[PDB]
Structure 1
């Protein structure tokens, strides 16, 4: 027999800011066995390593703002743990990686067994963004001056993507999105 324990199923949830990515990941995780979640936002660099543009906007919404080597190390640590998560006697451990900037990171371009992408239009995204507090906070004009233009850059970067993505309407309710993804996912596992 082919030894078990080495298989994993990795799900990517990306999408624009404030589109429900973290909540979706957590709702899926509550309904999937032996499932972990890694969040991209846990890997931002310290503000001293973050550059500022001509107009004084901090450059957070770009891969250079993230310690992606550290995030890879976290993925690898999950994989090591996953190999011991099922006692020997297939139950395939699940990882959900969720973050606003995943699908343009080339070292991970072959990791994704399923990929979802949450979308919300400009107006509602801006509204939702204004309800959240970041550290540091959004400066005046930050949405138009940085967040949205960087999101558009990301979407254009994804124009030549080498795997399939399922795009989701992030204006749908949390339960609606959970059920849609769960219905898809349980056919892929």
Structure 2
């Protein structure tokens, strides 16, 4: 209400460079906010474990999506007071969350190969840390569950090659946005 806004969704597999891209875009766009799905995970004490003892982090049940939706709604409610306000929402599980389907003005999806994804993942320390065999046992399977949930999407998603440099990825989205 009350002003035009421009909302960008950036999703992709874990470690595809979503957070870096969002931050880089925010540095070079005016009146630009970023909401990161990474901020809305439940604490470890509230995460489930599956039949094989893997913590269930890579599914929407691991996140406080009411709290994230609240932050997104609040951004929208307050946008007119800042004056086109831009919101980038970035996260590994966005395009399977139906309440967001109609909000996007642009949707980007970062893809990288499994080998490169696994490589990057091993360079990270999460809290809690990835348990042994977590990536093949939980992360990649859940990522494939996501991609197939995404088969029902009716809007246009722009697939981006996340093996491009951080600067190429920025530039590619930037060029798209000013068009």
Q: Report the TM-score when normalising by structure 1.
A: 0.92
Q: Number of aligned pairs?
A: 179
Q: Which of the pair has more CA radius of gyration?
A: 1
Q: Which runs of 4+ in 1 moved over 3 A?
A: none
Which of these residues, 34, 39, 42, is aligned with residue 36 of structure 2? 39
CA distance in 2 between counterparts of 1:163 and 1:69 reads 24
CA distance in 1 between counterparts of 2:50 and 2:73 reads 34
Q: Deviations over 1:87-108 (max 9, x none)?
A: 9xxxxx0000000000000011
Q: Is the 8 A contact 1:15 1:100 kept in 2?
A: yes
CA distance in 2 between counterparts of 1:151 and 1:39 reads 18
Q: Is the 8 A contact 1:44 1:65 kept in 2?
A: yes
Matched, 1:160 2:152: yes
Note the residue ranges of structure 2 that are not aligned, 5 or more in a row.
none
Matched, 1:110 2:102: yes
Q: Is the 8 A contact 1:5 1:86 kept in 2?
A: no
Note the residue ranges of structure 1 that are not aligned, 5 or more in a row.
88-92
Q: Deviations over 1:44-98 (max 9, x none)?
A: 11222211001110000000111101001001121232110019xxxxx000000
CA distance in 1 between counterparts of 2:49 and 2:122 reads 21
Q: CA RMSD in A?
A: 1.3
Q: Which residue of 1 aligns with 2:24?
A: 27
Moved more, 17-26 or 71-80: 71-80
Q: Report the TM-score when normalising by structure 2.
A: 0.97
Secondary structure of 2:82 counterpart = coil
Report the alpha carbon displacement of residue 185 of structure 1 after superposing the two structures with TM.
Answer: 1.1
Secondary structure of 1:84 counterpart = helix
CA distance in 1 between counterparts of 2:46 and 2:3 reads 37
Q: Is the 8 A contact 1:14 1:117 kept in 2?
A: yes
